[PDB]
Write a structure and sequence with these properties.
This is part of a larger assembly, with chains A and B. Helices cover about 30% and strands about 0% of the residues of chain A. Chain A is mostly helical. Classes of the chains: A mainly alpha, B alpha/beta. Chain A: This is von Willebrand antigen 2.
């Protein structure tokens, strides 16, 4: 809904990619000591979820 | 003479358990030393009112200041700031608990005050070394001792935390994510300790 078509470029409805998705290093956001300092400020759950994706 | 705002000038017996595992880096261990120094700075440090003892455990107790020691509080500050960084690969909560139960608090001579142990865990003791953990916690409970676990780091064993609380009415856990939170919660911790004031 926020696409801005130009004269030479015309917007087309973008759709979610048609694809199908163990490293698991994303756990560092909640396991490493340095990262965990942020847990009081910002919840790492969304970030780790995006990392899993 | 309170340095900034607080002076818990009441009969008390206090022991610290600065962790010596490698999980707390050199800077983190220095922050912990700053915590303990700034903590005792706001207490009436004297055998008459407050007894302070720092016991670094790196798989073996390394008591630098004993609760029986009688020296100038400035000297105690200096010693606390001078606690060396062990940097051991594995600490032992059970070992330090046994040390405090048998060799530090086993010869009651001042019931006027209370017994409080600040277990500042920052690493997971191997399960093979946790055979007598509950036994020592209960034994300290019999001796009128309140254990205040502090889960400093993310690796701080949390199963033992709230398990010390489970086997006691007053055992309160202060689970933190980093040593930085110690400065934030210093006032809260000293307040909580002074709620259980022996007067």
């Amino acid at each position: 809904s926020w696409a801005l078509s130009s004269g030479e470029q015309w917007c087309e409805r973008a759709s979610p990619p048609s694809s199908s998705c163990l490293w698991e290093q994303c756990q560092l956001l909640k396991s490493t000591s340095v990262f965990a300092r942020c847990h009081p400020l910002v919840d790492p759950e969304p970030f780790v979820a995006l990392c899993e994706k | 003479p309170p340095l900034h705002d607080f002076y818990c000038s009441r009969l008390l017996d206090l022991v610290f358990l600065l962790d010596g595992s490698s999980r707390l880096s050199e800077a983190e261990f220095e922050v912990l030393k700053a915590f303990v120094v700034d903590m005792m700075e706001r207490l009436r440090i004297s055998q008459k009112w407050v007894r302070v003892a720092v016991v670094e455990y790196h798989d073996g107790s390394h008591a630098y200041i004993g609760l029986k020691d009688r020296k100038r509080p400035s000297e105690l500050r200096r010693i606390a700031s001078q606690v060396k960084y062990a940097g051991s690969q594995v600490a032992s909560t059970s070992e330090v608990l046994k040390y405090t139960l048998f060799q530090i608090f086993s010869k009651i001579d001042r019931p006027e005050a209370s017994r409080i142990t600040l277990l500042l865990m920052a690493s997971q003791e191997p399960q093979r070394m946790s055979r007598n953990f509950v036994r020592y916690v209960q034994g300290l409970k019999k001796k009128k001792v309140i254990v205040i676990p502090v889960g400093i780091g993310p690796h701080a064993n949390l199963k033992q935390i709230r398990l010390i609380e489970k086997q006691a009415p007053e055992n309160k856990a202060f689970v933190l994510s980093s040593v930085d939170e110690l400065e934030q919660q210093r006032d809260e911790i000293v307040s909580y300790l002074c709620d259980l004031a022996p007067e």
